[PDB]
Amino acid sequence: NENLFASFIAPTMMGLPIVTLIIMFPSLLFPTPKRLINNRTISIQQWLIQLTSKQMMAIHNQKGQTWSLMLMSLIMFIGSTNILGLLPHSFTPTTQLSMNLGMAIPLWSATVFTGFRYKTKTSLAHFLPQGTPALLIPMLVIIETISLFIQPVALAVRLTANITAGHLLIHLIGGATLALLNINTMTAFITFTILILLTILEFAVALIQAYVFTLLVSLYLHD
Amino acid sequence: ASVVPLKDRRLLEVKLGELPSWILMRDFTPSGIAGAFQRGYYRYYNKYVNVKKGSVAGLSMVLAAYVVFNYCRSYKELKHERLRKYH
């Protein structure tokens, strides 16, 4: 009975203040120069694109490369709006589940209607995998279609659910420091747990690779 | 009032990060090569010295402005103050 942890009971509030300012604000962090040589703070933004434009280009190699100049705009928005919110009292728009159901469905259904305007038969004859055995036709095409319509829900809900899960352990491990007016040795160890956990919460960049990329595979496979 | 707020950012860019090129601005481009980072330096203590070509004081002022701007909205909710002042 040496080190008694404490807790504080307080509501954890994802309120909704004025959003249409907060969305526009990580656009003005990135400038664009009309010059040949630039000014050594855009120049490391301009290099960072020319890496990861050479990995969502290499797989496709089609005349579906026209689509890929948009997919690098999709990575900078939720790459920024997940990285701004680590600050003391900032607010992330990708916390709320509303816009992510408007980021999945106008993009996911832009893929199944891409081959249906050109191929019209073999896009969803990709439901036929192989040299058909007899015992498992109805067990297959009720499975590979129930794992198609999961994909818009599978794409949006994986983003909202772990981003907000980062924010609660920021509060709760952090709030247990404030309410630790018992023995002062254990206060540092909870603080040292925080400054490790904030390094893990720069996997909010790592979770945007797993949103543009499984949009490519959900584009490359259909087209 | 649109030419008023637009002439705020074009003053807080071309002075303290980073004053680009495209001649008709060529000597204006090297005006940022010395930089006003020596002017921006003295606020912290000395320690953010790496602002030479990755400029901290150019960027870390906007992010210090966006924190204290969001401290105002949160102030109504987390009141907590007694009939006194703190330590």
Partner: peptide, 24 residues
């Protein structure tokens, strides 16, 4: 001209084209 000269005067020798020319 200068090192930091222009983004259109350097657009004579090194080329630009129409939509979907540069593959890589």
């Amino acid at each position: 001209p200068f090192d930091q000269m222009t983004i259109e005067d350097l657009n004579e020798v090194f080329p630009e084209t129409k939509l979907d020319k540069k593959k890589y």
